[PDB]
Ligand binder design. Sequence first.
Ligand SMILES: CCN1CNS(=O)(=O)c2cnccc21
Ligand SMILES: CCN1CNS(=O)(=O)c2cnccc21
Ligand SMILES: N[C@@H](CCC(=O)O)C(=O)O
Ligand SMILES: N[C@@H](CCC(=O)O)C(=O)O
Ligand SMILES: [Cl-]
Ligand SMILES: [Cl-]
Lengths: 263, 256
Amino acid sequence: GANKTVVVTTILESPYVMMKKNHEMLEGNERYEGYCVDLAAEIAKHCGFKYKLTIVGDGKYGARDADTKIWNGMVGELVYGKADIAIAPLTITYVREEVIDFSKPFMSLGISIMIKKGTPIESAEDLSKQTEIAYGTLDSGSTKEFFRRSKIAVFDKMWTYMRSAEPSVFVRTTAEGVARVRKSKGKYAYLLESTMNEYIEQRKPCDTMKVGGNLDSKGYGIATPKGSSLGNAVNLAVLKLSEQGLLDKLKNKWWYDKGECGS
Amino acid sequence: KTVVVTTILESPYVMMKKNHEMLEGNERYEGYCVDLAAEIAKHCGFKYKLTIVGDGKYGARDADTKIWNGMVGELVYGKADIAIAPLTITYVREEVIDFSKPFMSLGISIMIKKGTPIESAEDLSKQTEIAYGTLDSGSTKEFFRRSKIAVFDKMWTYMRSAEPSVFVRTTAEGVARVRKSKGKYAYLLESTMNEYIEQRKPCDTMKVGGNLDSKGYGIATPKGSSLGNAVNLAVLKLSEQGLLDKLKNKWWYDEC
Ligand SMILES: CCN1CNS(=O)(=O)c2cnccc21
Ligand SMILES: CCN1CNS(=O)(=O)c2cnccc21
Ligand SMILES: N[C@@H](CCC(=O)O)C(=O)O
Ligand SMILES: N[C@@H](CCC(=O)O)C(=O)O
Ligand SMILES: [Cl-]
Ligand SMILES: [Cl-]
């Protein structure tokens, strides 16, 4: 049929998608800025479609309820036909690839540790061997599923602690995890993707840091419903933008050019 | 029936075993990609035959004839069913073959003989005493040829017309040339192979600077192959189980 506006699901996650300072008087895509906003514009230009950015209603990345088998978050938006494409820091995973399609990765990341500066923690093994410093992850995301599923001894030990910790060590948004690190006087460490860790490390008040190596190695992909006619073009678009150096330029723009913690 | 796997002799991905002359079939070979092939085939449930690519090339399309050579050509022209190798995911290749999600990350990197006064690609571009080049018929050469990025464009203009040729036929020859040119040759190659060589005797090379780009190796299949979906899920499964990390540790295991 005639061309239709593509519905893009995304999530309010800095610096991927952020409200512009004057958003209260703006409409449509103009309300937003950030890495994924710029990426969405590039992808759409290369694939030749118009689009509408829509923030996912439940503010979640996407997990499958064990009871009802219903997908929530952005994955759910794609699975149930509420969006045509997800352009967001959405991690490529086995269980998601079973139900949606992913482009080749546009950004690499690994699970990493965020501490308040001066916290006596250097590694995941460090965390697993003590109890004074609590630690947790985001809900409904790939990091929590990583620990839940891991058969690796250290990570399994961490999961058995996290799943039963009281009060809950899990948070609903990345921002909540960051606040919890900043406010807990070194007694909370946050497990999150290295991309978000490195971003926060450059924001005032510059009181956090990433420690140790990454726990795994993965990537974000642009996601489409299985069998979507958009998948092929979007995939080539990602590889073209990568080859041209544009993805590198966008990361520099949003992570480091705008960094608040010096040169 | 039996899946024909095209691969290439490239340490530590695929190597001839000691006394391979008395061995046969898949048993002749060892390495990261040999182990990976075994895991993939187990998860997908097929039997396979490892075969070394006839022309010993990764794959490039000839400008005139528009014929693909190397492992890419073997997939394009139906000589193999799947490629399991350090085969780089690129735009131009994705137009003619399919790739799994990446099983290993890499970037183009600089190898120098230790003590060479080079810190970066920018450094290389702005001098002429030290010659530099890349592998033939591979993604690295194609990257520089295609690049509009100013430093890389400048490097390409020099490399394409340098005499004698700065290009080499195999990775081993690039490394040998670095080691024998007394610091007057730098080799542009993927960080994976750079890091591997860095840890092997005579310990006289090193990787300098950051990587020039960021990409990955994928398992490749002909377009519309029945194997694509299962292979892709198998890679992600192996990744999440931590086995790709274990295999990297094994074959890049630490001479220096
Ligand atoms: C090589 C590690 N790995 C596993 N396969 S993936 O999850 O598609 C991925 C994506 N991006 C970078 C790395 C990466
Ligand atoms: C994020 C960079 N990037 C470009 N897209 S790719 O070439 O499919 C790839 C593969 N592996 C890691 C990274 C990677
Ligand atoms: N990128 C993750 C969310 C962040 C996290 O889980 O740490 C996902 O797609 O689920
Ligand atoms: N991995 C490369 C070969 C090595 C190189 O080009 O440096 C390819 O697939 O072409
Ligand atoms: Cl419309
Ligand atoms: Cl430039």
